[PDB]
Design a protein around this ligand. Structure first.
Ligand SMILES: */C(=C(\C#N)n1cncn1)c1ccc2[nH]nc(-c3cc(OC)c(OC)c(OC)c3)c2c1
Ligand code: NA
Length: 298
């Protein structure tokens, strides 16, 4: 009945689109700010994404869905609007940011992911530009995972919503092994975020110009520096977690659960409180992230 435009008016683009765009919008009733993701139904189906937001959006650190419309051609998904900026971007421009801090941020984010995996949900696009602060309080509880345009809910061949705990229905093997790939891959994305967090540079790209072939090469051989330069003042326990989060074999790689049982997370009070020495080139790290994931998606 009621139309999207009826109750909202569009504004600037807030970026990051695929078969879809995100624009700022004002609820022309209450004058509050929100985001809206406008998807092309002829280019992708948003159903699996919208449900995830409906069932799971309640999580404090999952972006909150406010509304949704369908004019038969596009789907409009009105969500929370982030005002604190992209989380990594803000973290890298803090000269006074220590390991105790990094462990809290990661705690909050892995806790969100672990839950999602317990409900048979995998993200599959956990790059940094999808994690944001909702406000400028700089508090972990203001962190938000914000897209889901690639997440998948585990389903039996029978069409049944499955959780990794209940197996008594039939799910195809290749779908299961893959649900273990996509979960491991999420953890690897977090490990990349952690790496960049501690040192101010990413593990497999120096900047946006790196060739897709050398980036992929670095990834395929695993092997990423964990000592010297900006790793000097970084504790051993942190380096241990990083190696196990970026472990080149998805199988030996840590689970969301196990990450959260790691001493770097549990005994966070042990962690050094002095500022981290890091490269300070946030725009370069931005380029390098996009180069890394591009080389992953093409
Ligand atoms: C657009 C989606 C998509 N696709 N998205 C989420 N994360 C990255 N891309 C989108 C959907 C809902 C949103 N709520 N707030 C924002 C938002 C994102 C960004 O990052 C570019 C901002 O700039 C830092 C921002 O500030 C206005 C809001 C958002 C994006
Ligand atoms: Na939420």
């Amino acid at each position: 009945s009621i139309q999207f435009t009826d109750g909202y008016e569009v504004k600037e683009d807030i970026g990051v689109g695929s078969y879809s765009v995100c624009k700022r919008c004002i609820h022309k009733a209450t004058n509050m700010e929100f985001a809206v993701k406008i998807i092309d139904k002829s280019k992708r189906d948003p159903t699996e994404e919208i449900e995830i937001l409906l069932r799971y959006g309640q999580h404090p650190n999952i972006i909150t869905l406010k509304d949704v419309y369908d004019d038969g051609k596009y789907v409009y998904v009105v969500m929370e609007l982030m005002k604190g900026g992209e989380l990594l971007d803000k973290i890298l421009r803090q000269k006074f940011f220590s390991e105790r801090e990094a462990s809290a941020v990661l705690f909050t984010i892995t806790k969100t992911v672990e839950y999602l995996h317990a409900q048979g949900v995998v993200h599959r696009d956990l790059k940094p530009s999808n994690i944001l602060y909702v406000d400028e309080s700089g508090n972990p509880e203001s962190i938000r995972i914000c897209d889901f345009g690639f997440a998948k809910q585990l389903r039996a061949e029978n069409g049944l919503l499955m959780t990794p705990c209940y197996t008594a229905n039939f799910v195809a093997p290749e779908v299961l092994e893959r649900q273990g790939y996509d979960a491991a891959c999420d953890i690897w994305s977090l490990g990349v975020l952690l790496y960049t967090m501690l040192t101010g540079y990413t593990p497999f790209a120096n900047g946006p110009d790196d060739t897709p072939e050398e980036i992929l090469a670095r990834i395929g051989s695993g092997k990423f520096s964990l000592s010297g330069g900006y790793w000097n003042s970084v504790s051993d326990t942190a380096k241990d977690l990083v190696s196990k989060m970026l472990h080149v074999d998805p199988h030996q790689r840590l689970t969301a659960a196990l990450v959260l049982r790691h001493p770097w997370i549990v005994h966070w009070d042990q962690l050094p409180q002095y500022q981290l020495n890091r490269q300070d080139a946030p725009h370069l790290v931005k380029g390098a992230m996009a180069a890394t994931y591009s080389a992953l998606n093409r």
